[PDB]
Write a protein that binds this ligand. Structure first.
Ligand code: J40
Ligand code: CLR
Ligand code: CLR
Ligand code: CLR
Ligand code: CLR
Ligand code: YLX
Lengths: 43, 120, 280, 321
């Protein structure tokens, strides 16, 4: 219990900023998010 | 396309083996003694019985044998005394125990077929 | 009044070609309806579809115009087609009953040896018995161009062909179905029989007088009137004049079994009523 | 324990939903069944994808572990299983091993490039999930409230991750393969490091037993599905809950949760024979993957994010793209 409380915690604001940063930077290469052409579709 | 044809041949043989296995699995009556996991199998009067001795891993079973020392709505209970319930005071002296399980399973089959036709 | 008859008979030929096609479509577009039992209720639907699309449209032209306006060969194929389709329909009702019978009496056969191949064999026997009453007696006994042209589409009133067709298409099947559904009743009544319990006894031996009454009443109230007439008149040529009105109502009552079959065997049980909902 | 209670409210500042009020919606995502993998004769309880995003493996109750080539719909290999009771399957990063397990308390490894090369024993309960840590180490989670790392060379529990009071039923390995998170019956999920058997962190937000979990692609967050008819996105660094994905029309439990390649879309499987797509940033239902006849048991997203495969109790796998 004590060591779990001992860990340092970042404020939810920077976690949100990092979660947004990772999502927007990788948005263009997600075939599910951005509908991909039938020329690429391998099925 | 030679490699593609070889892979298609590999698929064909696997499908044939699976078809034989399905033919052999449809004619098996699964029961559970609910009074590691244990399994037993035996044939009695041209009817193979596959009992397991031990909640959602067991769902498509035919009956639940349950002994008493003096998905459940859609499964009958063969109550032994050492949806319809079937009771038979145990008698290890003779092999009537096995005959009861046969007469019960045979009736569960007949009644399920009298409901599909819509006569019950 | 040719207009009134045309739209009445037209609606009947539409409801049949739609109802029988919806049944076969559901079997194909669902995996919950793919057992040996529904393969026989799809084959019956297909046969009624063939009746409703090939025979019925050309029987309605013959009624509204009161005369065959086509070739003599056309008349021969349509008399043959009509016999074939009707006989196969009656024997399909007798195959479904033979399968239902061996579920309630032989549980071992139901489990150890009941295959979709069984459906195929029951359907093959139904169509072999159809091509025995229709196509052997036509090819072989055909008068050499000695007939009248109009109102010429009439089944022979010969005495041998009368017994052969009537007995092999209705009287032999009817007797078998009466024996088979009699035994199914006794078996059901026994199992059901063997105050709240007495309540759900009455209410299980009174949904087994309904189902069997519906089936037998549909099959007898449709075909018996027609086969009784088809058996008595050939032998009583003099002094048994048959009025047009009644003689036409009976033929169309016989034809209406094709429309009623999907309703009795398909549109009633729950498994179809559920599949149609998922699709539509 | 007193400090733990205080720190949460102290660091909970602005709700992530408040921060995402500015982000624009994803619109509507419509996915269509591209292929249909058929051949299992019984209920399929699990399916894993190969790192090549082409080969996959499925485990069913007919004692069958089938390898399928998703592109050509061809059964590469059909491996029979000793037990007909099988709850988990896996597929090595290398590609030369699969691993199964179930009611029998044994994790059975099969060498691909097919015969059992090793059986791992020691757990006193049904194996719920297993994940290949690398080509030589495997992490398993069992129904006796114990997770374990296994050396395959000898065949012993190297470490044992204990502390959960309920049957651990879901297991997710981090992208860096350094930490892993486990979800159990006690409506709690615990972070563990493979290096030392010391529970790094514990998260308690759900109301019912947790059946699914999956790491966020970043590796700093995770999502948990439970029988509480809700999903929850926690954050490792924040050490608390950030968002809740639940809709009223849904009252059944979640069997599987998966992220997209960028982690924007959160696929989720349910007992209503449907799979609801959610916006991982907006808690909004972006779509439905209806079409399975029985319950959707396991769900997977390819490593390259090209397509999503769903297995179900109806003995059929569906690839959607
Ligand atoms: C005096 C005292 C007592 C006597 C008085 C009264 C009591 C009864 C008297 C006489 C009754 C006659 C007919 C009764 C019909 C009736 O009640 O039907 C029920 C209700 O269905 C609908 O409402 C739905 C029906 C939909 C029909 C199809 C509609 C579309 C037609 C056109 C199709 C083509 C265009 C779409 C359904 O059936 P059911 O309640 O009658 O009971 C059974 C039925 O008899 C079995 O045949 C059937 O088995 P199956 O052979 O496989 O079909 C069973 O599953 C079950 O349905
Ligand atoms: C009359 C001709 C020209 C048009 C076709 C009418 C057809 C579609 C109609 C006429 C009588 C109707 C039937 C009358 C009564 C019943 C009983 C009910 O419980 C179920 C529907 C059922 C069985 C109907 C089905 C549809 C039906 C057969
Ligand atoms: C599938 C359903 C809709 C039936 C389709 C065929 C129907 C529409 C056809 C079959 C035979 C046809 C009849 C044949 C002959 C005549 C005489 C002539 O004066 C035209 C009208 C009339 C009376 C036709 C009306 C339409 C008719 C009844
Ligand atoms: C072909 C068209 C014109 C007429 C069809 C008539 C049908 C619907 C009629 C004729 C005989 C009737 C049956 C006669 C007696 C009984 C027994 C009773 O306890 C329940 C209803 C039941 C089973 C009737 C159901 C409806 C029935 C089958
Ligand atoms: C519920 C189902 C079975 C009802 C079936 C009703 C059938 C038998 C009825 C409905 C309309 C009827 C037709 C209406 C009009 C005529 C014209 C008449 O000059 C001869 C009979 C004839 C051709 C009838 C034959 C019988 C008929 C086709
Ligand atoms: O209206 C017509 C026209 C046709 C030509 C096109 C199609 C019909 C010619 C025609 O006969 N009738 C009047 C119907 C008579 C009755 N139908 C029913 C089937 N019958 C039968 N089926 C099996 C065994 C014995 N008989 C006899 C024929």
């Amino acid at each position: 219990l004590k060591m779990e409380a001992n860990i340092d915690r970042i404020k939810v604001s920077k976690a949100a900023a990092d979660l947004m940063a990772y999502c927007e930077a990788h948005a263009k290469e997600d075939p599910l998010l951005t509908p991909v052409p039938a020329s690429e579709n391998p099925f | 396309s030679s490699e593609e044809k070889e892979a298609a041949r590999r698929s064909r043989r696997i499908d044939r083996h699976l078809r034989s296995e399905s033919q052999r699995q449809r004619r098996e009556i699964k029961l559970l003694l609910l009074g590691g996991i244990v399994e037993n199998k035996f044939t009695f009067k041209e009817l193979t019985f596959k009992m397991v001795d031990v909640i959602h891993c067991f769902e498509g079973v035919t009956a639940i044998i349950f002994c008493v020392e003096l998905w459940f709505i859609n499964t009958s209970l063969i109550l032994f005394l050492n949806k319809e319930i079937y009771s038979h005071f145990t008698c290890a002296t003779d092999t009537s125990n096995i005959q009861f399980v046969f007469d019960a399973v045979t009736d569960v089959i007949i009644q399920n077929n009298l409901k599909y036709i819509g006569l019950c | 009044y040719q207009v009134i008859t045309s739209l009445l008979l037209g609606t009947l030929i539409f409801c049949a070609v739609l109802g029988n096609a919806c049944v076969v479509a559901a079997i194909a577009l669902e995996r919950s309806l793919q057992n040996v039992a529904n393969y026989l209720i799809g084959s019956l639907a297909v046969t009624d579809l063939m009746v409703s699309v090939l025979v019925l449209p050309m029987a309605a032209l013959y009624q509204v115009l009161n005369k065959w306006t086509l070739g003599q060969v056309t008349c021969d194929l349509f008399i043959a087609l009509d016999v074939l389709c009707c006989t196969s329909s009656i024997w399909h009702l007798c195959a479904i009953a033979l399968d239902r019978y061996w579920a309630i009496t032989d549980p071992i056969d139901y489990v150890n040896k009941r295959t979709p191949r069984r459906a195929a064999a029951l359907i093959s026997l139904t169509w072999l018995i159809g091509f025995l009453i229709s196509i052997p007696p036509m090819l072989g006994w055909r008068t050499p161009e000695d007939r009248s042209d109009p109102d010429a589409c009439t089944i022979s009133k010969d005495h041998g062909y009368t017994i052969y067709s009537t007995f092999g298409a209705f009287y032999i099947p009817l007797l078998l179905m009466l024996v088979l559904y009699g035994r199914i009743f006794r078996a059901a009544r026994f199992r059901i029989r063997k105050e709240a319990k007495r309540k759900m006894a009455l209410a299980r031996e009174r949904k087994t007088v309904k189902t069997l009454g519906i089936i037998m009443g549909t099959f007898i109230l449709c075909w018996l009137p027609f086969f009784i007439v088809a058996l008595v008149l050939p032998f009583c040529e003099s002094s048994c004049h048959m009025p047009t009105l009644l003689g036409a109502i009976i033929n169309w009552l016989g034809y209406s079994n094709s429309l009623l079959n999907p309703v009795i065997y398909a549109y009633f049980n729950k498994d179809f009523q559920n599949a149609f909902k998922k699709i539509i | 324990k007193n400090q733990i209670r205080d720190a949460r409210k102290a660091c909970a500042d602005a709700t992530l939903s408040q921060i995402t009020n500015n982000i624009d919606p994803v619109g509507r995502i419509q996915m269509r069944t591209r292929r249909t993998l058929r051949g299992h004769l019984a209920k399929i309880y699990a399916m894993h994808w190969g790192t090549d995003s082409r080969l996959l493996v499925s485990a069913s109750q007919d004692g069958k572990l089938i390898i399928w080539d998703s592109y050509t719909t061809n059964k590469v290999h059909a491996i029979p299983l000793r037990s007909s009771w099988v709850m988990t399957c896996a597929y090595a990063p290398s590609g030369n091993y699969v691993a199964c397990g179930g009611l029998d308390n044994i994790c059975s490894i099969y060498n691909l490039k097919v015969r059992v090369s090793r059986e791992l024993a020691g757990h006193t309960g049904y194996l719920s999930c297993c994940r290949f840590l690398d080509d030589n180490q495997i992490v398993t989670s069992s129904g006796d409230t114990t997770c374990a790392l296994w050396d395959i060379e000898t065949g012993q529990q190297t470490t044992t991750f204990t502390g959960h009071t309920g049957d651990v039923m879901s297991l997710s390995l981090a992208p860096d393969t350094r930490l892993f998170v486990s979800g159990a019956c006690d409506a709690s999920a615990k972070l563990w490091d493979v290096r030392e058997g010391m529970c790094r962190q514990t998260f308690t937000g759900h109301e019912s037993d947790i059946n699914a979990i999956c790491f966020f692609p970043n590796g700093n967050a995770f999502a948990t599905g439970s029988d509480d008819a809700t999903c929850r996105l926690f954050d490792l660094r924040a050490d608390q809950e950030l968002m809740t994905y639940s809709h009223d029309n849904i009252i059944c439990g979640i069997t599987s949760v998966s992220f997209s390649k960028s982690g924007r879309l959160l696929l989720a499987g349910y007992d209503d024979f449907n799979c609801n797509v959610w916006d991982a940033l907006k808690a909004d239902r972006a779509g439905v993957l209806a079409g399975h006849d029985n319950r959707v048991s396991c769900l997977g997203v390819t490593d390259d994010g090209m397509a999503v495969a769903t297995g179900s109790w109806d003995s059929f796998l569906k690839i959607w793209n």
